[PDB]
Subunit: 357 residues, 3 copies
């Protein structure tokens, strides 16, 4: 039993047609008591074919949108105008709750895959979408108002309102496109916009923290991007404050997560993650990851302010190397000098050769 | 079933005599799961006859006090002095938890009606009042201390303490009056102290936001005041972040609230509100309101920071008018030009003639 | 039934050997609904004999550490070094979650007693400790990683890793020692570092508030230290915002706590606290305390920002003395002048002679 592992098939389909799909991960606390810290957050996946449009809608939740694959055009509609953004792979943006938006895949050949992280507040753990369009699955929300309210509001006869706004035009909310100051800070940012925080011949990790990004600061979230070569190992380490929701994007990751529970109580959670699989890494739990193939993953860290990552192996940022000999001698079965010598054997930091010996 | 509607008779009487009453609305989450966002808030109503006093007491909760009808004298007692405020109709003030206060109706002819919004923190969803006076319903809290503690504290014999402080003087906590720097920011503010944000021949809305008021900023609350002429319609719109607790003060309001639930799932909640009735308008839910008579209402918006109200009809702030023709053509059954022409039929903004046609 | 009283024997033993013990108080909300405000907090007690070491570990929770008796050396390990602090009696320090630390009792004769207040966020109401050492009760968390992960991480054969780091060296996590800029603000602070806020011939109270201390500001906690002579009474008073967790350190305290509940509803909770006993004083509840012996207590106030303590007896800060005669006459059975005269009988403030008369 691994209560931290969310396979790709634990996403429920909200909508699917020939043009794309929207899927919603089960609540983090559906099957476990151990993830109450995550009860206000939901994960969605949006996939769309080339030359498609997701129709205008607003969400009741704040959304952090990330392009995992492809390219998008995002339009955010405000009461007095609209903002249009091109999103390339690795671009993220916050969409404030209550902003009507639509999404286009402008590519002629490549699918679009987007991760949406929902931060709920209206009804904690619930995310709702309000589509202007009537479709087979639901009438327009405008159609729920009475005839008298609609005729008065639009100063128009009901039959004109029904024929122009309310009747079903599209089968579904993903459609094919027709065939032949504060502006700067609210803009998309790329996960690889800055130098990687860890980088060697085996792997790289990029990280954007709330301390360095105003959209993330509002949400208390960090975003990271992991790139590893086949055979590389991201050595045992833990996060002091962030709980990381780790999403497999490309490749296969062999994760080992070490936990302490209340039912003594030391547990190895081990899983190989394929594309779309998620594992939650609680703060203070040691974790390591071996690349079974060339891989790319994205991490969404909640409770992110003042997070510090502590390493247990390798040369740099290894907390065990900072214990003085007289105390390491009492802590470990080796002598102080033997512990010190063992911890100096690994000349690499962060990512190492994971080949068996 | 309308889980958002709280009729005036869902207030329970905490105290009533010939001089006035104090009533407490049932918990927002008593009968529904849909209002967990409101579980820390309670609504009270205080009504008193001319020339009456509500006896000194402190609350365990923060209170936002609003005069709906009449005039009051409010006295706030601190350890080193007291502050005295005159409150006229529409005046609001925050009373910090643990401040002993009393309230007078100084008018010789007009009742006093006050709305108290309680923000609980000691015992989430519970509000308690500690009265110094012994009355039929409860002894003074001072009387719960032992004789030895009282005699030592007051350096006085128990019989003097009992005769001067503890014995019952009044039947109840509402009594008749005897017949013949930081001071500036902590002061009462009127809901109509600034120009209305929306104003035409049909209606006005005044709004005070936490961005513009230091007492509201502490609570993350906005306060609004709605005035409409009989026959006027406040057209379909939604709030991006605020959940508004709408209180009918004067007149009859025909509300249409449009919701999305999880048991597809589009619902019209329609009710005519008379004086004292409440309806909760969740953020992102479209809402409209027709005046069945000249009316006045007060709205208490929780989660208020950075709220934006999006209109769905009328000329100004209409988000549907900001969708470009090529996308409105795909969104709606009308052509782009037909949608644009329909949305330009209503020349008014915010409030319109609601007469049936 | 006193749901606010936590006797010393409601601490469960997490670990005990001949060198010391670590104990964990039951959850505040285990046996009552009345302390939901405290569900994220846990109280621990650490006791150790002379010349002992608590082995290196990190916690998943923030810890506020206070020395109740004796002296300690605290070492905080960071990824790039370590900080060493001497803690004397009354010294407090915040240990951020995820910081590996160890604790020494360097005294040759005196036990060390520490109070740890845990502020949980990973799993609300749960605190976990990750020890590097394998002991009888649990293997090292490093031992939960696979052989292949360990050999690759440490670039060393498993047998060397097992013999140097993983095999059991110590029976338990408390061992005997071998026999023959931001640095300033992160440092320990003493509860008696400033003048006492209340001080007379009967008692003293020291208090450190989040407004005056950056470590406490992060946690929204105040810390107080009470010293009273046998026979002294800390007169009836209440806190406007803070809920105080009162810990008996030395001596016997006769507490009277006055509460209002929902099952009219006035209750005296009276108990004599001996060393190690705790009582929770909810905000707005009147409280008084008589010293049955010379005593010292420590109070941990949660929800501490802008707390104000209101006195009900004595000369200074007595809110009842600030009610004008015309209203005290209506509030109390005595005349306005009789109330005023009674409240002036006690010439002392805060602490008074508690001798029976």
């Amino acid at each position: 039993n691994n209560p931290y592992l969310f396979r790709s098939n634990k996403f429920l389909t909200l909508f699917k047609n020939q043009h794309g799909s929207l899927r919603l991960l089960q609540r983090f606390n559906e099957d476990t008591e151990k993830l109450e810290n995550l009860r206000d957050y939901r994960v969605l996946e949006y996939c769309s074919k080339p030359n498609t449009l997701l129709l205008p809608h607003h969400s009741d939740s704040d959304l952090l949108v990330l392009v995992l694959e492809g390219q998008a055009i995002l339009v955010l509609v405000n009461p007095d105008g609209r903002d249009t953004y091109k999103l390339d792979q690795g671009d993220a943006i916050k969409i404030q709750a209550g902003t009507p938006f639509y999404l286009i895949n402008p590519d002629n050949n490549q699918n679009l895959r987007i991760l949406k992280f929902a931060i709920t507040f209206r009804r904690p753990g619930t995310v709702e979408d309000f589509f202007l369009s009537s479709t087979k699955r639901l009438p327009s929300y405008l159609s729920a108002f009475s005839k008298n309210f609609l005729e008065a509001s639009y100063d128009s006869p009901y039959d004109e309102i029904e024929q122009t706004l309310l009747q079903e035009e599209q089968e579904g909310v993903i459609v094919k496109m027709p065939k032949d100051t504060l502006s700067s800070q609210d803009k998309p940012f790329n996960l690889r916009s800055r130098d990687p925080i860890y980088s060697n011949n085996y792997g790289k990790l990029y990280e954007i923290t709330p301390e360095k990004n105003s959209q993330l600061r509002d949400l208390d979230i960090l975003l990271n991007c992991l790139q590893m070569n086949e055979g590389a190992l991201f050595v045992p380490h833990y996060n002091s404050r962030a709980t990381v929701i780790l999403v497999a994007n490309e490749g296969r990751a062999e994760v080992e997560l070490v936990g302490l529970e209340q039912q003594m109580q030391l547990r190895r959670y081990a899983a190989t993650l394929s594309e779309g699989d998620i594992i939650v890494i609680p703060s203070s739990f040691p974790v390591a990851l071996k690349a079974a193939s060339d891989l790319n993953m994205v991490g969404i860290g909640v409770n992110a302010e003042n997070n510090e990552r502590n390493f247990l192996a390798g040369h740099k940022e290894n907390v065990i190397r900072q214990i003085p000999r007289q105390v390491s001698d009492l802590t470990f079965p080796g002598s102080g000098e033997e512990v010190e010598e063992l911890l100096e054997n690994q000349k690499e930091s962060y990512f190492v050769d994971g080949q068996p010996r």
